[PDB]
Amino acid sequence: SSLHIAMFPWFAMGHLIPYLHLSNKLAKRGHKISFFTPKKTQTKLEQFNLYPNLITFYPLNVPHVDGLPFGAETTSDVAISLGPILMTAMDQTQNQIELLLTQLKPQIIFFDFVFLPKITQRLGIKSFLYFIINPATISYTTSPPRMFEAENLTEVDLMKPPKGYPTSFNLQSHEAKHLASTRKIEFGSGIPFSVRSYNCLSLTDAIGFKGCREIEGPYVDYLQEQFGKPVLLSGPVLPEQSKTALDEKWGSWLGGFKDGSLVYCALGSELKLKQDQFHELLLGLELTGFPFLAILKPPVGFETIEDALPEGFKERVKEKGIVHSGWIQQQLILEHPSVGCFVTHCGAGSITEGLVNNCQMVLLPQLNGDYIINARIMGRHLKVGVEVKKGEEDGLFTKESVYEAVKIVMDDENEIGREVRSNHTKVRNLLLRHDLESSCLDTFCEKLQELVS
Numbered sequence: 001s002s003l004h005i006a007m008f009p010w011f012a013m014g015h016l017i018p019y020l021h022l023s024n025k026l027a028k029r030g031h032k033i034s035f036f037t038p039k040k041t042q043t044k045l046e047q048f049n050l051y052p053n054l055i056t057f058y059p060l061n062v063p064h065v066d067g068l069p070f071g072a073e074t075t076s077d078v079a080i081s082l083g084p085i086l087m088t089a090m091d092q093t094q095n096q097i098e099l100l101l102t103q104l105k106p107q108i109i110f111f112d113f114v115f116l117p118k119i120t121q122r123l124g125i126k127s128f129l130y131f132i133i134n135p136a137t138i139s140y141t142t143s144p145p146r147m148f149e150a151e152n153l154t155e156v157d158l159m160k161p162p163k164g165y166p167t168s169f170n171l172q173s174h175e176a177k178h179l180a181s182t183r184k185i186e187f188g189s190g191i192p193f194s195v196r197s198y199n200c201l202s203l204t205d206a207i208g209f210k211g212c213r214e215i216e217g218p219y220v221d222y223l224q225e226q227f228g229k230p231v232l233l234s235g236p237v238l239p240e241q242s243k244t245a246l247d248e249k250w251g252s253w254l255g256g257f258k259d260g261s262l263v264y265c266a267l268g269s270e271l272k273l274k275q276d277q278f279h280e281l282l283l284g285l286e287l288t289g290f291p292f293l294a295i296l297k298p299p300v301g302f303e304t305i306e307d308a309l310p311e312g313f314k315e316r317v318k319e320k321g322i323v324h325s326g327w328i329q330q331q332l333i334l335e336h337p338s339v340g341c342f343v344t345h346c347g348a349g350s351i352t353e354g355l356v357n358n359c360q361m362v363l364l365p366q367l368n369g370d371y372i373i374n375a376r377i378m379g380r381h382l383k384v385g386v387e388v389k390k391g392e393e394d395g396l397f398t399k400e401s402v403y404e405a406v407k408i409v410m411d412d413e414n415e416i417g418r419e420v421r422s423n424h425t426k427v428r429n430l431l432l433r434h435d436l437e438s439s440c441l442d443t444f445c446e447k448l449q450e451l452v453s
């Protein structure tokens, strides 16, 4: 039988988009989806609704919280430092979520962050904490062994995996420092960030992750052993086709470059670089001599790209490079044959989009546990990309380190570049295998049926 699933993702494009990708896959299997979305954001989500008779948007009014800029709905509308206030606003949607669940009566609700399971169990609804970040990240930072150390969890503690963690990778000091401090910072309604997610893991009926057994398997198994409840895999949430074609201005411009020659650089929809690293990144792209498209917000303190560019940059780069601040159709650009290289911040969505395409992967993780852990998995486990070197303590890169990573992967004769191309091809062939996502979804849906039995 078909399930009625409500979707309540976090107010971030990187969550709304894969939740919608998955919603389309579920609706293709006949499941009815009630998709909760901030009101104004719905208009930008319609392009992805491929089953409007089965996927219905229900608007949420993102409530005022002091400090939240007026009208803000998504982390793409606020500075990164304001995310915790937006999380308070998500928390404050509880009354309109309660009303929506009582009138719609879904069997399951997929959610982020809102540690909701008390409400759903009162209503006879199953709660499903559905992560679109890597289970390797949640396992590394939010498994019980981490939380029981409470505020005795040090940067040195975070340099090693929690007890029983299934794999090995190295963090730099500044990354472990980042994880040790930001973990404690309130993220909505006075709740420390890692405590919030731990509460969700603890209180939810079941957990799910974007991913497949071949890659995410060991972490989902670890989390299932740790939290003693089902930890499902949706499949890798392969991007679905939008109803909107590639913007002709980008299509025309990209079409003027030789196949595989262009370096696409984008650091997601939330973050702003500081100026010095904005400069180093752009000068590093320039040093390669390849054409490039860099999708970047103006750096901290600046309101336009033009004002922040290194001196003489436009005049030197001429028509071979564009630095652009607006939202673009990233998935469609990564499919364009001109793109030979993706310099990515290693956001989980961007990783999948790179993996399913042909672009060589250059890993520029920004300071966020999921970006960093994605970068280590991609660079050291799957070995599908080359990571730009950062200072051990300062977390900064040089323009030369950017240059060298792009040069390595774009050089047909470079053995490391050939290696990551070959490994990327192996991973792409897995993710796109004719039965991989479908068999993941088969299992996913069977386990969801078990959840509501």
Ligand SMILES: O=c1c(O[C@@H]2OC[C@@H](O)[C@H](O)[C@H]2O)c(-c2ccc(O)c(O)c2)oc2cc(O)cc(O)c12
Pocket: 010, 012, 014, 075, 083, 111, 112, 113, 114, 130, 131, 132, 133, 137, 138, 141, 142, 194, 196, 197, 200, 368, 369, 370, 371
């Ligand atoms: O990056 C992280 C992340 O996602 C990010 O959390 C921070 C927000 O600002 C971003 O928009 C969001 O993508 C989440 C998260 C996402 C969805 C959830 O339901 C949830 O409980 C946690 O956990 C994390 C835990 C870490 O130890 C480290 C991280 O780096 C993240």
Ligand SMILES: O=c1ccn([C@@H]2O[C@H](COP(=O)(O)OP(=O)(O)O)[C@@H](O)[C@H]2O)c(=O)[nH]1
Pocket: 012, 013, 014, 015, 017, 266, 267, 268, 269, 270, 271, 295, 326, 327, 328, 329, 330, 331, 346, 347, 348, 349, 350, 351, 353
């Ligand atoms: O200008 C942009 C920036 C981002 N994205 C999409 O937004 C999502 C960003 O998610 P990700 O996890 O990569 O990073 P985040 O933006 O959450 O930091 C991905 O699907 C990108 O394709 C896009 O289409 N256009």
